[PDB]
């Protein structure tokens, strides 16, 4: 009783790395094996499985108290397996890998599975500034992922897929249109600052701009109009989202970006900024996040903030901002009270 | 040594089902080796887009199974990911009882196009004996059992710091909707009587040639009523479909004329799409046709691929009518192909 | 003779998986006899509206589970189908190995809201014992393995009929399109100044009221023109919605006067489920208002159940002000409630 | 090991039945286990579970060669389990029960699986007219099914609320609308025979009448509309459907109604007409069904018709009508070749 297939197997390797630097690693103070994760990032080609770097600044359990446990975790996937190989390396002060550690073999993976070699590095050893492993007191991690697919004959019909179309693009040319401005069809005024933008892209992409230009303004004041809502720095990023569908400079000014998106009803940018603020939940902000969410109907981030406050209530409620929020906005905490009413029902 | 703790409990999902596929009139299933005939494709129901089929041969392959029956399975579909599964094969007797029930040892690695089955499953002559009660009126009744293991994962107990459901890109879809709705059209395009309506900036960005015409201080006569005769209406419609969506579902059946239209406006992305679509149509007779289409349109990649195809299939390409037509019509192509095959593939030794 | 075969091989459907539940600070998760505390929901992943939640007793039930920790499995959600399944509990040691695992003799019966398990699943003292090491940092570890069996058959197939596919009755949604696009309507109705304009034949067919008041001598005079003098417009809308569709999506928040108009306009199907929906809103305080509203308007079944529930809750119904109100205004109604009570309390 | 559930048990049953008629039982000649079948039957309300019966006029296997096998076959369900109990009976010429048999218990059920009673009644004894079981050689059998529902505590608030709500009488009201012609405005003629109808109902159902009446030529057309292709009884049943959505006697007059549906773009009408034709399949009718379907864009019916033709080419290609339709309509047989070549043949 033996089974075989008699087929040529071509092994694929979709390599992709990630850079992570922890701001002020020394004051992490993550005792009891409490963990810090990286910013969400995708796997490059075929953006459907997304990886993420997970670090415990102090290694769990008594054995790795001095050590810094390091693991790599997969954010989400469509209920399948991955057979990747990982290489953990630490860059020096000048940016050269020192603590390289390549996986001896491919590891079986599933959604949320963590893998890594415990006792990766001693924290006191890392803290030595003379070694250059903490430039400006920042802990830099660099990881190299190589996902193995194990395709049999790559479905050979020859049609081997020699050559290819270039990578699918459009947004890059729209970015060139943005920066050059290419004599667009309308003008914008923003707090005195001048911006030059198109009409058809605004109308098709945004219902708000779809209705706002074409209703009596196409000849009256189609060329010129003033927006007293958005500062020019983030207005540039919002217009960049209109052009290329992305906002690389989104994290820093994300609250006013949320305001601008909600006023114009940019739902996709609304979800991106919801994910951005989802990564910035603490004791000293969650009440203001609730104000922003109800001000914008950010239902996903609203529920996430509700759950986070439910989890960390015993010290989140000790903030002055919470007091100002509840006295100013009791209805929001009444909604949270209704949400927790079902939670505390059982038992 | 190098060890990596899992730090996730090995909870496992296992899913066992079964299915039978009978064969009426099995005794009259012809008689020669290599008769690969498969079962009707079947599915669990909770399959999650997965299908399977058997591979029954009246005479087994290789040497030992000359007088046996070879039974093998296949994975019809998968979501471009590996599958770990099991298979058990058995035969129901006259009283519907499993007789040749031998199980597998461990769940094997399964992908689309791969097959795993017990070689030398059962003797042909022994099954041909009616005393075993296994051939009722030439109705051979198979039966198989699948047990797909997954090694499932959750933080089920308890709590989950969740992500927000990100939406997918809508730029391609929204521009396509603007195209088909044809709202805010700044230019009207006419081809062979049919009149379409399109937009200025997208056409200028994705087609430098259209930007070249419409930037020449002449728009009110041309941009509002531009007329083109080179491109037929259906190719031209698919060309705007490419520009406004980057998606051409029926690109292969209209590849050469669309390539010519792309060459007219230097739509190099759609040009390489047409090159790739043509290149998955390789045959000995149309090599000259694709070569001249590339040479007229300067499709360097497809021209090189067609020349390599001619180099590989010269023995029949020389006798083909297309090669003779190319030779009498275009000796330059003959010279270029000869130079291409000259300093490669034979100069040894 | 008496027999019942299948003519098909007994193939069996099975879905085996497992689930764990973490519990913090077990030493301070309260302790008294028969404590009902449950877990968060969970399922395999291919659930098909199928969910379960654990149910654990820090101190068990009855008598012989005081010093024990019993455990049960409640079926939370299901597709209203009889669920037959096996289950297997376990406890993991400190070294990561299941220890106290026992599996059901057969696939127990499960339906929505049914609990099953093994009473006396573990001694509380033994679990609390430090030598076993089953409670590190006052954290109690669960691990359950479960399989669900259905016993269906998958045949080779000759495709059978192969064409059971058919659109359901989409009819009278077209009448919805007639209404909320007005699709050449032919008569004109005024409610409270607000205007709505419809087809004569529809309301003629639907109820005797609109039919009769148009069928005789009004077609000559006011065939198109007509107005109503008792119905509220915002509910007038949903009233036509049911009259067209035989379906009212939003009814409970306006069901009282809707039902009153329905009896005023003879809509028996509307009448009955609006009464039941108000009866689904049964409470101690509403019952007087519901009773007077009901029996003022021929509400037979609702009269019966309103009377019965008021009999069942007479004690706290007494101090309701509405009780004395209807007693003062409509005494014969509560007299007939007594008449109901006559045969009610014959024994015992 | 043993466990409880701590609950009440409320059982609810709604039983139902349906006549079966088999004319000329002697001449059926359904041997070697040729199962006789008809359309699936339901319980009336809540048609989501469609039941059916499977009968062998000659019982298979050596035991029941002379006997007749009578077995239920549930067609489809939402992947659930049901515990219905069933009884059967065969009436006499007068319609009186003599050959009655019942079930021992509440048998389980799933999609496709069959319970019943083999080895019951003789074929020769049934065929003996001295017994009087076959009036004019007509086998008229009766089947009843009692669906035992069962549940746990019915969510034991006591939650009773059992309003005896009737069903949606909208079609029945439209049944009276067609039958009585109350409030009629528009009339029709066909071959001199005249039967009138209503305007907005036809506007609702059809896109075709919507086309040829919305054009503002109503008084000339809609007052005295005429149709050419349809026939009187055919128009009767097509009016019956377009008013009702039901046409239980469509089987004997199905083809004509399919043609009428093609004349009026009545997609649901065409659907169950094609379904009735799917219960018209024979080894010799496939040419006629092909002519009908291919003339009418009947993609699904031509699909399974071609599947039948592929499966029974061994006689289909050997019929005279096959040659006739090839001569008249060859190209459709060309796609028949295209299908059967790429079907149950790409092996190997």
GROMACS .gro file of N, CA, C and O in nm, chain D residues 215-256:
model
  168
 1259UNK      N    1  -4.836   5.204  -2.427
 1259UNK     CA    2  -4.810   5.289  -2.543
 1259UNK      C    3  -4.920   5.392  -2.570
 1259UNK      O    4  -4.909   5.464  -2.670
 1260UNK      N    5  -5.022   5.403  -2.485
 1260UNK     CA    6  -5.134   5.498  -2.490
 1260UNK      C    7  -5.243   5.454  -2.587
 1260UNK      O    8  -5.345   5.525  -2.597
 1261UNK      N    9  -5.228   5.342  -2.658
 1261UNK     CA   10  -5.337   5.283  -2.736
 1261UNK      C   11  -5.406   5.174  -2.654
 1261UNK      O   12  -5.390   5.055  -2.677
 1262UNK      N   13  -5.482   5.220  -2.554
 1262UNK     CA   14  -5.559   5.131  -2.467
 1262UNK      C   15  -5.704   5.116  -2.511
 1262UNK      O   16  -5.755   5.003  -2.516
 1263UNK      N   17  -5.771   5.226  -2.543
 1263UNK     CA   18  -5.913   5.220  -2.576
 1263UNK      C   19  -5.938   5.135  -2.701
 1263UNK      O   20  -6.038   5.063  -2.709
 1264UNK      N   21  -5.848   5.143  -2.799
 1264UNK     CA   22  -5.859   5.058  -2.916
 1264UNK      C   23  -5.822   4.914  -2.882
 1264UNK      O   24  -5.892   4.820  -2.923
 1265UNK      N   25  -5.714   4.895  -2.807
 1265UNK     CA   26  -5.660   4.762  -2.778
 1265UNK      C   27  -5.715   4.708  -2.646
 1265UNK      O   28  -5.784   4.605  -2.644
 1266UNK      N   29  -5.687   4.778  -2.535
 1266UNK     CA   30  -5.715   4.723  -2.402
 1266UNK      C   31  -5.863   4.700  -2.379
 1266UNK      O   32  -5.901   4.610  -2.304
 1267UNK      N   33  -5.949   4.780  -2.443
 1267UNK     CA   34  -6.093   4.758  -2.430
 1267UNK      C   35  -6.134   4.625  -2.492
 1267UNK      O   36  -6.212   4.549  -2.434
 1268UNK      N   37  -6.082   4.596  -2.612
 1268UNK     CA   38  -6.120   4.478  -2.690
 1268UNK      C   39  -5.996   4.412  -2.749
 1268UNK      O   40  -5.986   4.386  -2.869
 1269UNK      N   41  -5.897   4.385  -2.663
 1269UNK     CA   42  -5.774   4.320  -2.707
 1269UNK      C   43  -5.800   4.181  -2.765
 1269UNK      O   44  -5.889   4.107  -2.720
 1270UNK      N   45  -5.722   4.146  -2.867
 1270UNK     CA   46  -5.728   4.019  -2.937
 1270UNK      C   47  -5.590   3.955  -2.938
 1270UNK      O   48  -5.488   4.025  -2.946
 1271UNK      N   49  -5.587   3.822  -2.929
 1271UNK     CA   50  -5.463   3.745  -2.934
 1271UNK      C   51  -5.484   3.633  -3.034
 1271UNK      O   52  -5.596   3.583  -3.052
 1272UNK      N   53  -5.376   3.591  -3.099
 1272UNK     CA   54  -5.380   3.500  -3.213
 1272UNK      C   55  -5.328   3.361  -3.181
 1272UNK      O   56  -5.397   3.262  -3.207
 1273UNK      N   57  -5.208   3.351  -3.124
 1273UNK     CA   58  -5.145   3.220  -3.108
 1273UNK      C   59  -5.216   3.134  -3.004
 1273UNK      O   60  -5.223   3.011  -3.021
 1274UNK      N   61  -5.268   3.194  -2.898
 1274UNK     CA   62  -5.314   3.117  -2.782
 1274UNK      C   63  -5.445   3.049  -2.821
 1274UNK      O   64  -5.511   3.089  -2.918
 1275UNK      N   65  -5.484   2.946  -2.746
 1275UNK     CA   66  -5.607   2.871  -2.761
 1275UNK      C   67  -5.692   2.891  -2.635
 1275UNK      O   68  -5.640   2.932  -2.531
 1276UNK      N   69  -5.826   2.864  -2.642
 1276UNK     CA   70  -5.915   2.903  -2.531
 1276UNK      C   71  -5.880   2.845  -2.394
 1276UNK      O   72  -5.862   2.921  -2.299
 1277UNK      N   73  -5.871   2.712  -2.381
 1277UNK     CA   74  -5.833   2.654  -2.252
 1277UNK      C   75  -5.691   2.693  -2.214
 1277UNK      O   76  -5.659   2.706  -2.095
 1278UNK      N   77  -5.605   2.712  -2.314
 1278UNK     CA   78  -5.468   2.754  -2.287
 1278UNK      C   79  -5.470   2.893  -2.226
 1278UNK      O   80  -5.402   2.920  -2.126
 1279UNK      N   81  -5.549   2.983  -2.285
 1279UNK     CA   82  -5.565   3.116  -2.228
 1279UNK      C   83  -5.627   3.108  -2.089
 1279UNK      O   84  -5.593   3.189  -2.003
 1280UNK      N   85  -5.718   3.013  -2.067
 1280UNK     CA   86  -5.781   2.999  -1.936
 1280UNK      C   87  -5.676   2.970  -1.831
 1280UNK      O   88  -5.668   3.037  -1.728
 1281UNK      N   89  -5.590   2.871  -1.857
 1281UNK     CA   90  -5.490   2.837  -1.756
 1281UNK      C   91  -5.381   2.943  -1.746
 1281UNK      O   92  -5.322   2.961  -1.638
 1282UNK      N   93  -5.353   3.016  -1.854
 1282UNK     CA   94  -5.249   3.118  -1.846
 1282UNK      C   95  -5.300   3.240  -1.769
 1282UNK      O   96  -5.225   3.299  -1.690
 1283UNK      N   97  -5.427   3.277  -1.788
 1283UNK     CA   98  -5.491   3.372  -1.697
 1283UNK      C   99  -5.493   3.321  -1.554
 1283UNK      O  100  -5.473   3.398  -1.459
 1284UNK      N  101  -5.516   3.190  -1.536
 1284UNK     CA  102  -5.519   3.135  -1.401
 1284UNK      C  103  -5.384   3.154  -1.332
 1284UNK      O  104  -5.379   3.194  -1.216
 1285UNK      N  105  -5.275   3.129  -1.404
 1285UNK     CA  106  -5.143   3.151  -1.344
 1285UNK      C  107  -5.116   3.299  -1.321
 1285UNK      O  108  -5.072   3.339  -1.213
 1286UNK      N  109  -5.139   3.383  -1.423
 1286UNK     CA  110  -5.098   3.523  -1.412
 1286UNK      C  111  -5.181   3.594  -1.305
 1286UNK      O  112  -5.139   3.699  -1.254
 1287UNK      N  113  -5.299   3.542  -1.272
 1287UNK     CA  114  -5.370   3.589  -1.154
 1287UNK      C  115  -5.319   3.523  -1.027
 1287UNK      O  116  -5.305   3.590  -0.924
 1288UNK      N  117  -5.287   3.394  -1.031
 1288UNK     CA  118  -5.265   3.313  -0.911
 1288UNK      C  119  -5.119   3.283  -0.882
 1288UNK      O  120  -5.075   3.295  -0.768
 1289UNK      N  121  -5.042   3.244  -0.984
 1289UNK     CA  122  -4.915   3.179  -0.962
 1289UNK      C  123  -4.925   3.029  -0.941
 1289UNK      O  124  -4.824   2.967  -0.905
 1290UNK      N  125  -5.043   2.971  -0.961
 1290UNK     CA  126  -5.064   2.827  -0.949
 1290UNK      C  127  -5.143   2.780  -1.070
 1290UNK      O  128  -5.221   2.857  -1.129
 1291UNK      N  129  -5.123   2.655  -1.107
 1291UNK     CA  130  -5.190   2.596  -1.222
 1291UNK      C  131  -5.181   2.444  -1.209
 1291UNK      O  132  -5.115   2.379  -1.291
 1292UNK      N  133  -5.247   2.384  -1.109
 1292UNK     CA  134  -5.218   2.243  -1.076
 1292UNK      C  135  -5.251   2.144  -1.186
 1292UNK      O  136  -5.196   2.033  -1.186
 1293UNK      N  137  -5.338   2.180  -1.281
 1293UNK     CA  138  -5.370   2.096  -1.396
 1293UNK      C  139  -5.294   2.140  -1.521
 1293UNK      O  140  -5.344   2.125  -1.633
 1294UNK      N  141  -5.173   2.195  -1.504
 1294UNK     CA  142  -5.093   2.236  -1.619
 1294UNK      C  143  -5.029   2.119  -1.692
 1294UNK      O  144  -4.986   2.136  -1.806
 1295UNK      N  145  -5.021   2.001  -1.629
 1295UNK     CA  146  -4.941   1.891  -1.683
 1295UNK      C  147  -4.994   1.846  -1.819
 1295UNK      O  148  -4.918   1.837  -1.916
 1296UNK      N  149  -5.123   1.816  -1.827
 1296UNK     CA  150  -5.181   1.768  -1.952
 1296UNK      C  151  -5.174   1.871  -2.064
 1296UNK      O  152  -5.172   1.833  -2.181
 1297UNK      N  153  -5.170   2.000  -2.030
 1297UNK     CA  154  -5.169   2.110  -2.125
 1297UNK      C  155  -5.050   2.201  -2.098
 1297UNK      O  156  -5.065   2.322  -2.079
 1298UNK      N  157  -4.929   2.144  -2.091
 1298UNK     CA  158  -4.811   2.220  -2.048
 1298UNK      C  159  -4.742   2.292  -2.164
 1298UNK      O  160  -4.701   2.408  -2.150
 1299UNK      N  161  -4.726   2.224  -2.278
 1299UNK     CA  162  -4.644   2.274  -2.389
 1299UNK      C  163  -4.697   2.407  -2.442
 1299UNK      O  164  -4.623   2.506  -2.454
 1300UNK      N  165  -4.822   2.406  -2.487
 1300UNK     CA  166  -4.897   2.528  -2.518
 1300UNK      C  167  -4.876   2.641  -2.417
 1300UNK      O  168  -4.856   2.756  -2.455
   0.00000   0.00000   0.00000
